[PDB]
Nucleic acid binder design. Structure first.
Ligand SMILES: [Zn+2]
Lengths: 116, 27, 225, 126, 333, 52, 421
RNA sequence: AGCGAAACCACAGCCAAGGGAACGGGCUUGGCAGAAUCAGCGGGGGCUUGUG
RNA sequence: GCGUUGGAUUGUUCACCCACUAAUAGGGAACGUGAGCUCCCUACUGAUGAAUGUUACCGCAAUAGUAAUUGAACUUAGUACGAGAGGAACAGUUCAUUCGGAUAAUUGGUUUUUGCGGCUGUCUGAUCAGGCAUUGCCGCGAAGCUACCAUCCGCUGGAUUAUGGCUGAACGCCUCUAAGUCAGAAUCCAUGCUAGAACGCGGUGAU
C-alpha cells in the first residue's frame, strides 16, 4: 500500500476511494473524491479555489516549508530491514506528529494576531 | 402412454368398418 | 550451455524474466518449472528473485539492470521494492526512477559496460543510469524502431538484433558496443528478439520453439562454447 | 473481471504505427448471447474491426483487434478505479504478434499481463 | 424468474429460522451448531491473497465485507425431540429458573400493562433439590435423539431500542445424549462467547429475512459458504488494528455505523454481503459439512480495515486524522 | 462440463474431507471448554462474594 | 491441397448411406399430418421433406468429392503414386459417377416439388413424396459398386505417407533384402521390418533426419525385378528430386547374384541419369567397375556393424544435395557442475520440492527463506507499512534517529524563545 | 363523510376424461372442496411417418 | 436434466450467404400472444380473516415447488502416441460466460435535505432579508428511487438406463439372466433450498 496525496486536494487517498485518471501524456492523476474530479474536467486551477491545500501552501494560511515537512519526502532507496530500525520509527512518527501540530499551532497564533 | 377406453365414434366406427369387410368378401 | 524452457506455455521468456551476471528475476505464479529451469542452470551461487513489479507477472520487459545496479519503474509498490533489497547483496544497488514511461525493458538495453536508451527520455534518467550502473549511456534507435530493448538482446560477449537491420547500422553500432552484431531471429522467425530470449556472459535462455538454425546463430555470436 | 465500455458499433482510435487511424467494431470474440442486448467489449479483449480511415493496404479487410484503451471507469484489485482519455485499439494477427513496431499512448495493465508481445511492443505502460 | 422460490410471500417473523442443522460427529465432545446476531453495515477490506495457482497470487486485493454485531448469548432452556415415524416431536423442553427481563418480555405482546407474572409458578417448581426438574431432564436423557438449546439475545448490550429478546433454537452436535444434557445442565443461565462457536478463516452460511420494499421482498433467504474474516472481542481495544497497520482504532467508523450504533462488544466480519439490512437479526449456522476446497483451506492475512465514515464521504479514519490534517480551527481555540 | 450433482466433483471432494478443517474445529472446541467454562468459574467468584 | 490426406470423412456402403439420410428426413422433420388440414399446409409439409432429403444426399456427396484429391490436378509424382496403387481410370469414373448422381438428386428435387404444388388431394400429395424418395433411393442403390471401392481408397490414402518433393530427399533402393532395412533402422528412428524373404515392405517407408542444422528425408523403396509393386519403385526416383542410394552385397547373402545387380543398373538407367547416383556395397571384382561406365558413380566398401562407416554414407550424401575492456564471469558459476536429470544424489529444485508437498497449482510459492538478511531470526517479516494517514516508507531510511536528534535540538531553541503562550 | 343511478338479469358458475352428430354448462367416472373478504394482471370466455 | 445468435432483401419474402458461439435440433398448444403487431364468470399473484379452553413463545413437516450452466488457462507435456508433421487425458488448481439469489463499500440516470455558493425576471426609500419564479438557471451534494452500470454466493448420498461384468442354468459345451449378483448417464429419488396444511400435530409459560 501507499497513501497518495491528491492532485486537486493533496488530501490522503485511501484504496477503494476516489477515481484515478490517465492522460495520453501518461502520469497519475489521483483524486480523493468525484467532486474534485468533476472540477478538473472544467479546467479549474487548484490554487484559485480555497478549500484545498494548493491555495493554502501558496498564499500564507498554513506553513509550506518546515523541518517536520521535509521528513515526509517521497523516499526512493530500499533498505535491508532491521527489527530495531523500524521499532524506532513507531516512536519517531508519533513524536514528529506532535511537533507538526504544535508549530502549526504556533503558525495559527502568528496568523490570528491583528484582531487584538 | 396410450388409453384403453374405446370412444363411441370408434366403437361404432369399427362396426362400420366391419360392415365394409362383409360386402367386400361377397364381391 | 543454452537452455530451452517455457513459462505458461508462452514463447516469450524475456517478458516474464530478466537475467544478469549477478542475479535473475522471476515472476510468481502457479508454475515453478520456469523457476526450476534457472535453478538447474544457475544453482545457489547467484540469487534468483521471486518477485512482482507493480503487481504484474510481466517483469523482464518492465525493468533494467546489470552487475552493479537495478532499475525499477515509478509504478513499483513499496513491499515489492522491500523484498528486492531483502534478497540482493551490497554489490548490487536498487533505485526507483520517477518517470513518464514505465517500460524500462523496452527502453534500456544494457550490460555491465554499455547502455542503449530512448532518444525521447528525460535528462535526469541519463544522469542516474551512468551513476548507479557504472555504464556509458547512448541515445540511439535501431532500424527506425524506437524501442531498443524489445528489438535487441545484449551481453558482454555478443549482441542480437532483429533481421530488418541495415548493414550500415550493424557495423556502426558494433563500434559503440566494441563487440560484433548479428541481425537474426529467435522463436521460429519472430521480430521481437530481446523479449524472445534472455542472455548474459555464460547463459542463454530461449523459448521452446527456437529452432536449431536459430540456436546455432546464438551459440556463435554470444560465444557459449 | 473488468467493466465493459466499447459496444458493437463503436469508433475506437488507432494507437500503433501501422497506417490506420480508426477501427469500427462489428463483433466481439468470446461473447455472451444476451436477450435484447448486443454484447460489449472491454480492455484486452479481441474484436473484429474494419478500418474506416487509413491506407489501401489495410482497408477492405476484416481483422481481429486488441483493445488497449477503454475510456470507461473500470475496477482494479488494488483499490482505485481508473479510465483512459479515449477509446482506442491496436490491430494484430490471430497469434498476438503486433503489426505495429511502436505504440503511442498508454496501454492498460489488464491488457498487458494477458498478451506477452503487447507487453513488449508498448511505449508507455499505464 | 426462479421457480423454486415460491411462494414469493412474507416470512413468518423478523427472525427467519434455521431449516437444517449440521449432522453429527459422535467422537467430538459437545458443541453448539450455530449463533445469532444483528447486521451492521458494510466495510471495505484489503488483504494479500495467499491463494496458490492464482492470477492474483500474493497481490493486494480489495473486497467489501459486512460486520454483524453478535453479543454473547445466554441459555435459558434445553429441549428433547424424539424420532417418530412422523418426523420429530419435542416430548419435553425444560428451563433454568432465573430468566432475564428481556426473555420474559418475549412472552408478552404488551409488557407495560402486564403484572410480569410469567416464569413464576415454574420457578417454585425449581425450589427444592430438583425432584420434578431433574425428572424432566431424565425424561430427555432416556429417549430423544437430538437435544436442542433454548437461548436468547442480550439486547441491552445492543445499541438497538427493540428491548425484546429473540428466542432461537440451536441444537448440539456433541456426541452422546448423556453428555448433551450434562453440558446444558452446567450452562443454564451462563453467557456463551462468540469466539467459542466460530474461528477466523472459516466457511459459514447465514440466515436473514430480506430487505422489504413495497408483494416484493421480505422473504427468508439462506446463503451458503461465506468466509469469516475477523472475530473481534469488545474488551480488547483496537479491533481495526491488524498485525500490519497496528494503529489503535475500532472497526466502527467515525460516529457509528450507518443507522447503527457503536460496536461496544463482540462482532463477526464475514466475506461479501449477508441478506436483509442493518438492525435485522441473522443466525449463522456452521455449513452442514466439510467443504474442503482451496476456497476454504486458505488462512487469511488481513492488512487494513477501512474505518472511514461512510455517511457522506470519508477522507480520514480516526478523529486523530482530522486535526493532524486541518491543524486547529475557530471553536477549538 | 460437469454438474454439481455429477460423479466427478463428488469423488474429488470426498477424499479431502479428513484435512485440517476437522482438526481446526477441535482446536477451537477446547476454547469452548476453556473461556465459557471460565464463565462458570467467574460467576462462582461472585457467588463467593455473596456467600461471604 | 497439401500432401497429407487423413482428414477425409468416411463413406458409408450405399445401404448404410441410405439409412443415414432416409432416416434423417424422419427424425429431423415433422412426421404427422391430419387428413382434414388445409391443402396448402399438406403441400408444404412434403416439400419440407422432399427438399430436405434432396439436400441430404447432395450434402453427403459434397463431403466426398471435395474430400478426395482430383488425381491429375495434384502432382506429377502423386498422379503416378495413386495410379500404381489404384486403377486411375476406375478412380476417375468414381469422381464422375458421383458427379452425375449429385446432379440427379438435384434433378429429382426440382422436378417432383414442381409436381407437388399441383397435388390436390392427400393421396396424390403423399404418393408423390414416396415417388420422390423412391427415385432418389434408386440412384443411391446403383452406387453400391463405386462406394465400396471408395471405402478401400478412403483407408489406403488415409495411411499413405506425406512426402515432400521440394525437400532434401534421398531414395534407398536395391534388390529385396540386401540390407536396406538394416540401413534405415539405425540411421533414423523409423521401424522397418528385417525378415529373410522376398517382398518384406510393399510400400514407401520415410525416415526423417537432420544434418548441418538442415532438414532431410530418406525414402525406402520396395524392390525391382511389369507389376504394380515394381512400378511404384520405378517412379519413386523418376519423379522425385532425389539422389538414388543403390545398395549391393559382396557376399553369399540376399539370395540374388551380384551379376543381376549390374544388369539391373544398365536396364533402368534411362531415368536416374540426371539425378546423381550414389552406390554403396555392404571376374568378381572386375564386373563391379562395369557399373562405373555410367557418368554418375561411386563405390565404397562398408561394414554396417560399426556405426562410423554407415554414418560416412550420410555425410557424403548430404554434401551431394547441397551443391545441386574485459567481460565478467563469476567464479562460483564455473565451479558448480551442469544439471543431471537422472542423478540420484543432487540439489533439489522447486519442481521436486513442490511435488513432495503435492500437486503444482496447490502449494503457495513461499517468498520467505529465499532472501539474504543480516540475521536470519526475523525471516518471518512483519512490517508496519502504514502509521496513521502516512505510510512508513515515506519516513523509513537508515540513520533517521540522528536526523530526529537534529530536530530535537530545534525544539529547545524554539521553546525558550516563547512561541507557546 | 353526504347524495346517488343505469345497462343487465332462466338458473348457477373448480379442474381431467368420456359423453357418436364442427353441442358442452347441469349428466357418467375420477381429482378434489371449509366460513368471510380486499389489491393486481390486462389472463381466458385410432387418421399419419422411409425406401417410386 | 440444461442450453439453442447477429446482418444486406418486402412488385405479390413464398431464394440465400460470412460473423461469432459448445451448439446456433425439429415440432405442438388452431382462428396460440389479430380486441401487444405490418361495471357477464373465474384461473393466477399475493393480502387479511371467525372457528376448534383463552393468550403467548419455541417447534415439527404431511404436501407443493426447486437450479445452476458452459468454456478457457496453469501443472499432468511438448510425456504417452507418431517416420515426422503434429499432439492428449484422468488426478490437482484458477478464472470467466449466461442464469439465479442476495447486497450498496465504491461507480452511475438520480433529488421535492427543494442542502449550500453564483446569476436573473421582479422589488421593498437603499445596503441587509430573497418575498416570489405552473419545480427559474448553473456548480456540486448526503439521504433515498435504483442498475452487468457494480460486489458476494450458487451441495453430497442413494437407486438406475445404455453399457461392461461375476457366478451360472435352460440345453451333460457355451452364454451378463432365467433364480442370483458388482460397477455404471448432466437421469431418477433423496440431501440441501422455498412455503407451511388457514379444519395436520407437539412441547412450554400465565390464573
Ligand atoms: Zn480532492
Amino acid at each position: 500500500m501507499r497513501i497518495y496525496q491528491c492532485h486537486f486536494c493533496s488530501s490522503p487517498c485511501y484504496p477503494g476511494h476516489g477515481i484515478m485518471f490517465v492522460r495520453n501524456d501518461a502520469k497519475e492523476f489521483r483524486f480523493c473524491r468525484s467532486k474534485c474530479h468533476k472540477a478538473f474536467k472544467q479546467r479549474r486551477n487548484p490554487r484559485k479555489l480555497k478549500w484545498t491545500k494548493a491555495f493554502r501552501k501558496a498564499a500564507g494560511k498554513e506553513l509550506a516549508v518546515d523541518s517536520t515537512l521535509t521528513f515526509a519526502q517521497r523516499r526512493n532507496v530500499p533498505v535491508r530491514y532491521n527489527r530495531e530500525l523500524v521499532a524506532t520509527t513507531l516512536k519517531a512518527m508519533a513524536r514528529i506528529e506532535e511537533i507538526r501540530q504544535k508549530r502549526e499551532r504556533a503558525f495559527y497564533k502568528n496568523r490570528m494576531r491583528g484582531n487584538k | 402412454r396410450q388409453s384403453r377406453r374405446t370412444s363411441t365414434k370408434l366403437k361404432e366406427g369399427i362396426k362400420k368398418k366391419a360392415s365394409a369387410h362383409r360386402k367386400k368378401e361377397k364381391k | 550451455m543454452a537452455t530451452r524452457t517455457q513459462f505458461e506455455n508462452s514463447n516469450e521468456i524475456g517478458v516474464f524474466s530478466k537475467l544478469t551476471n549477478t542475479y535473475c528475476l522471476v515472476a510468481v505464479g502457479g508454475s515453478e518449472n520456469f523457476y526450476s529451469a534457472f535453478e538447474a542452470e544457475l544453482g545457489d551461487a547467484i540469487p534468483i528473485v521471486h518477485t512482482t513489479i507493480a503487481g504484474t507477472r510481466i517483469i523482464g520487459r518492465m525493468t533494467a539492470g546489470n552487475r552493479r545496479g537495478l532499475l525499477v519503474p515509478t509504478q513499483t509498490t513499496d513491499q515489492e521494492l522491500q523484498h528486492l533489497r531483502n534478497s540482493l547483496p551490497d554489490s548490487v544497488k536498487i533505485q526507483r526512477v520517477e518517470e513518464r514511461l514505465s517500460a524500462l525493458g523496452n527502453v534500456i538495453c544494457c550490460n555491465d559496460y554499455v547502455a542503449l536508451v530512448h532518444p525521447d527520455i528525460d535528462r535526469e534518467t541519463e544522469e542516474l543510469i551512468s551513476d548507479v550502473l557504472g555504464v556509458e549511456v547512448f541515445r540511439q534507435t535501431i532500424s527506425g524502431n524506437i524501442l531498443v530493448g524489445s528489438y535487441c538482446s545484449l551481453s558482454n560477449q555478443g549482441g542480437l538484433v532483429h533481421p530488418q537491420t541495415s548493414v550500415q547500422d550493424q557495423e556502426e553500432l558494433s563500434s559503440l558496443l566494441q563487440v560484433p552484431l548479428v541481425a537474426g531471429t529467435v522463436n521460429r522467425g519472430s521480430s521481437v528478439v530481446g523479449a524472445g530470449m534472455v542472455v548474459n556472459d555464460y547463459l542463454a535462455v530461449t523459448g521452446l520453439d527456437t529452432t536449431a538454425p536459430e540456436l546455432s546463430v546464438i551459440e556463435s555470436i554470444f560465444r557459449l562454447q | 473481471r473488468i467493466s465493459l465500455g466499447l459496444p458493437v458499433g463503436a469508433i475506437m482510435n488507432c494507437a500503433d504505427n501501422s497506417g490506420a487511424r480508426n477501427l469500427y467494431i462489428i463483433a466481439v470474440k468470446g461473447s455472451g448471447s444476451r436477450l435484447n442486448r448486443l454484447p460489449a467489449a472491454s480492455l484486452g479483449d479481441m474484436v473484429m474491426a474494419t478500418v474506416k480511415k487509413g491506407k489501401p493496404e489495410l482497408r477492405k479487410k476484416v481483422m481481429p483487434a486488441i483493445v488497449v484503451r477503454q475510456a470507461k471507469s473500470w475496477r482494479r484489485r488494488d483499490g482505485v478505479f481508473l479510465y483512459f482519455e479515449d477509446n482506442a485499439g491496436v490491430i494484430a494477427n490471430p497469434k498476438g504478434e503486433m503489426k505495429g513496431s511502436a505504440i503511442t499512448g498508454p496501454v492498460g495493465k489488464e491488457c498487458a499481463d494477458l498478451w506477452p508481445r503487447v507487453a513488449s511492443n508498448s511505449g508507455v505502460v499505464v | 424468474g426462479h421457480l423454486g422460490f415460491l411462494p414469493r410471500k412474507r416470512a413468518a417473523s423478523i427472525r427467519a429460522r434455521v431449516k437444517a442443522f449440521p449432522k453429527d460427529d459422535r467422537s467430538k465432545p459437545v458443541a453448539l451448531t450455530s449463533f445469532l446476531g444483528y447486521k451492521a453495515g458494510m466495510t471495505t477490506i484489503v488483504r494479500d491473497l495467499d491463494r496458490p495457482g492464482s492470477k492474483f497470487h500474493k497481490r493486494e486485493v480489495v473486497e467489501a465485507v459486512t460486520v454483524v454485531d453478535t453479543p454473547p448469548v445466554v441459555v435459558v432452556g434445553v429441549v428433547g425431540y424424539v424420532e417418530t415415524p412422523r418426523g420429530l416431536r419435542s416430548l419435553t423442553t425444560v428451563w433454568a429458573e432465573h430468566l432475564s427481563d428481556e426473555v420474559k418480555r418475549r412472552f408478552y405482546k404488551n409488557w407495560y400493562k402486564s403484572k410480569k407474572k410469567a416464569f413464576t409458578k415454574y420457578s417454585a417448581k425449581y425450589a427444592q433439590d430438583g425432584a420434578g426438574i431433574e425428572r424432566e431432564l431424565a425424561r430427555i436423557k432416556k429417549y430423544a435423539s437430538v437435544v436442542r438449546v433454548l437461548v436468547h439475545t442480550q439486547i441491552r448490550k445492543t445499541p438497538l431500542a427493540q428491548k425484546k429478546a429473540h428466542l432461537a433454537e440451536i441444537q448440539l452436535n456433541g456426541g452422546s445424549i448423556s453428555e448433551k444434557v450434562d453440558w446444558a445442565r452446567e450452562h443454564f443461565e451462563k453467557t456463551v462467547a462468540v469466539d467459542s462457536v466460530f474461528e477466523q478463516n472459516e466457511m459459514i452460511d447465514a440466515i436473514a429475512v430480506t430487505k422489504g420494499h413495497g408483494q416484493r421482498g421480505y422473504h427468508s433467504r439462506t446463503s451458503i459458504n461465506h468466509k469469516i474474516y475477523r472475530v473481534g472481542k469488545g474488551d480488547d481495544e483496537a479491533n481495526g488494528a491488524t498485525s500490519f497497520d497496528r494503529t489503535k482504532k475500532t472497526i466502527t467508523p467515525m460516529g457509528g455505523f450507518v443507522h447503527y450504533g457503536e460496536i461496544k462488544n463482540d462482532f463477526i466480519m464475514v466475506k461479501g454481503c449477508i441478506p436483509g439490512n442493518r438492525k435485522r437479526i441473522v443466525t449463522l449456522r456452521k455449513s452442514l459439512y466439510t467443504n474442503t476446497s482451496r476456497k476454504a483451506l486458505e488462512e487469511v492475512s488481513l492488512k487494513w480495515i477501512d474505518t472511514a465514515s461512510k455517511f457522506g464521504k470519508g477522507r480520514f479514519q480516526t478523529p486523530a486524522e482530522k486535526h493532524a490534517f486541518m491543524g486547529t480551527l475557530k471553536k477549538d481555540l | 462440463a460437469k454438474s454439481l450433482r455429477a460423479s466427478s466433483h463428488l469423488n474429488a471432494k470426498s477424499v479431502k474431507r479428513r484435512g485440517v478443517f476437522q482438526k481446526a474445529v477441535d482446536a477451537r472446541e477446547q476454547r469452548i471448554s476453556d473461556k465459557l467454562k471460565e464463565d462458570l468459574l467467574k460467576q462462582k467468584l461472585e457467588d463467593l462474594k455473596k456467600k461471604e | 491441397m497439401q500432401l497429407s490426406w487423413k482428414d477425409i470423412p468416411t463413406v458409408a456402403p450405399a445401404n448404410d448411406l441410405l439409412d443415414i439420410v432416409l432416416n434423417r428426413t424422419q427424425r429431423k422433420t415433422p412426421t404427422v399430418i391430419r387428413p382434414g388440414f388445409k391443402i396448402t399446409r399438406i403441400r408444404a409439409f412434403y416439400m419440407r421433406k422432399v427438399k430436405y432429403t434432396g439436400e441430404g444426399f447432395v450434402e453427403k456427396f459434397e463431403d466426398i468429392l471435395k474430400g478426395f484429391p482430383n488425381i491429375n490436378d495434384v502432382h506429377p509424382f502423386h498422379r503416378d503414386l495413386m495410379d500404381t496403387l489404384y486403377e486411375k481410370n476406375h478412380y476417375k469414373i468414381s469422381l464422375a459417377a458421383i458427379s452425375r448422381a449429385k446432379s440427379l438428386v438435384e434433378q429429382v428435387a426440382r422436378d417432383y416439388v414442381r409436381l407437388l404444388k399441383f397435388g390436390q388431394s392427400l393421396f396424390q400429395c403423399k404418393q408423390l413424396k414416396r415417388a420422390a424418395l423412391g427415385r432418389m433411393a434408386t440412384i443411391v442403390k446403383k452406387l453400391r459398386d463405386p462406394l465400396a471401392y471408395l471405402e478401400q481408397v478412403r483407408q489406403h490414402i488415409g495411411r499413405l505417407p506425406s512426402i515432400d518433393p521440394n525437400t532434401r530427399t534421398l531414395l534407398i533402393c536395391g534388390y529385396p533384402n540386401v540390407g536396406k532395412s538394416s540401413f534405415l533402422r539405425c540411421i533414423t528412428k523409423s521401424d522397418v521390418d528385417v525378415q529373410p524373404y522376398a517382398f518384406t515392405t510393399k510400400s514407401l517407408y520415410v525416415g526423417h533426419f537432420d544434418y548441418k542444422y538442415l532438414r532431410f528425408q530418406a525414402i525406402d523403396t520396395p524392390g525391382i525385378l511389369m507389376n504394380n509393386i515394381e512400378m511404384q519403385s520405378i517412379y519413386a526416383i523418376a519423379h522425385l528430386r532425389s539422389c538414388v542410394l543403390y545398395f549391393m552385397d559382396l557376399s553369399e547373402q540376399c539370395g540374388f547374384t551380384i551379376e543381376a545387380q549390374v544388369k539391373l543398373f544398365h536396364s533402368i538407367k534411362p531415368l536416374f541419369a540426371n539425378k546423381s547416383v550414389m552406390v554403396v556395397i555392404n571376374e568378381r571384382a572386375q564386373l563391379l567397375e562395369s557399373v562405373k561406365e555410367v557418368p554418375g558413380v561411386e563405390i565404397m566398401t562398408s561394414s554396417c556393424q560399426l556405426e562410423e562407416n554407415v554414418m560416412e554414407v550420410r555425410n557424403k550424401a548430404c554434401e551431394k544435395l547441397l551443391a545441386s575492456r574485459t567481460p565478467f564471469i563469476p567464479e562460483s558459476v564455473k565451479n558448480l557442475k551442469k544439471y543431471d536429470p537422472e542423478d540420484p544424489n543432487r540439489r533439489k529444485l522447486a519442481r521436486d520440492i513442490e511435488a513432495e508437498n503435492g500437486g503444482a497449482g496447490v502449494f503457495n510459492v513461499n517468498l520467505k527463506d529465499k532472501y539474504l538478511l543480516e540475521d536470519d531470526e526475523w525471516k518471518n517479516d512483519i512490517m508496519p507499512e502504514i502509521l496513521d494517514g502516512k505510510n512508513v516508507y515515506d519516513f523509513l531510511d537508515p540513520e533517521i534517529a540522528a536526523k530526529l536528534q537534529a530536530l530535537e535540538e530545534e525544539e529547545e531553541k524554539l521553546e525558550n524563545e516563547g512561541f507557546y503562550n
